[PDB]
């Protein structure tokens, strides 16, 4: 119908704004728990399994420009990330690149499922000492890579660019449910909550009668 779990995720929304200066490049980490619209909808379920697909959108400040051959890259988990704009990590063969102009219609690229375990895990309870490859509740089976946007020129670009990343999900299967979050979380990677001021769930009224 439309209440099945495939349609419940299959809208694509903003994830992260990645902007560069000329350093000359702007890296970014894949983290789908960026905003709060999508973190509350994906800690609904414990174990997930899904193929992503991205879409980059470039807008120069003041809007629109003459073309340039900016590239998008991708790093699989377990590989070193770039450091400078001209280092030799931009010429390896394992990192798939995407060459796309400004004035062309936007770029789109899929990503398959990238974990050694047979599902993702948004809740881990243990220590990674003799685990998978302080430290409470952080597993290395969740990182998915980087992107490392770079403009292609020999020198002197001076564009002051800005990109966006839209993320769709596909073929998503869930597993065992969990109740929804109701305390507004503070840190990014922990379930913490300001326990000095615990908020309520229902707005109050006068008394128990007089509905």
């Amino acid at each position: 119908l439309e209440t099945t779990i495939n349609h419940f995720f299959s809208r694509s929304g903003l994830v992260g704004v990645v902007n560069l200066t000329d350093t000359g490049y702007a890296t970014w980490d894949i983290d789908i728990m960026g905003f709060v619209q999508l973190r509350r909808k994906c800690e609904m379920f414990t174990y997930m399994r899904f193929n992503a697909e991205f879409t980059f959108v470039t807008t120069t400040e003041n809007g629109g420009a003459r073309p340039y051959m900016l590239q998008y890259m991708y790093v699989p988990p377990g590989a070193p990330k770039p450091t400078g704009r001209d280092a030799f990590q931009w010429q390896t063969a394992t990192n798939p690149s995407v060459f796309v102009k400004l004035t062309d219609p936007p770029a789109q690229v899929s990503v398959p499922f990238m974990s050694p375990a047979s599902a993702y895990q948004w809740f881990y309870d243990g220590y990674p000492t003799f685990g998978q490859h302080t430290t409470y509740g952080l597993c290395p089976n969740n990182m998915m890579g980087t992107f490392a946007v770079r403009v292609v020129s020999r020198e002197a670009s001076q564009l002051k660019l800005q990109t966006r990343v839209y993320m769709k999900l596909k073929h998503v299967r869930a597993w065992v449910p969990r109740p929804i979050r109701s305390q507004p979380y503070l840190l990014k990677n922990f379930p913490n909550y300001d326990s000095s001021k615990i908020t309520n769930s229902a707005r109050d009224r006068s008394s128990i009668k007089q509905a």
Binding site: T46, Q121, F123, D125, L186, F190, N192, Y193, S195
Partner: peptide, 12 residues
């Protein structure tokens, strides 16, 4: 509860 994760009660 499967996967029972507790969190610290601080705020900073």
């Amino acid at each position: 509860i499967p996967e029972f994760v507790i969190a610290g009660r601080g705020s900073n």
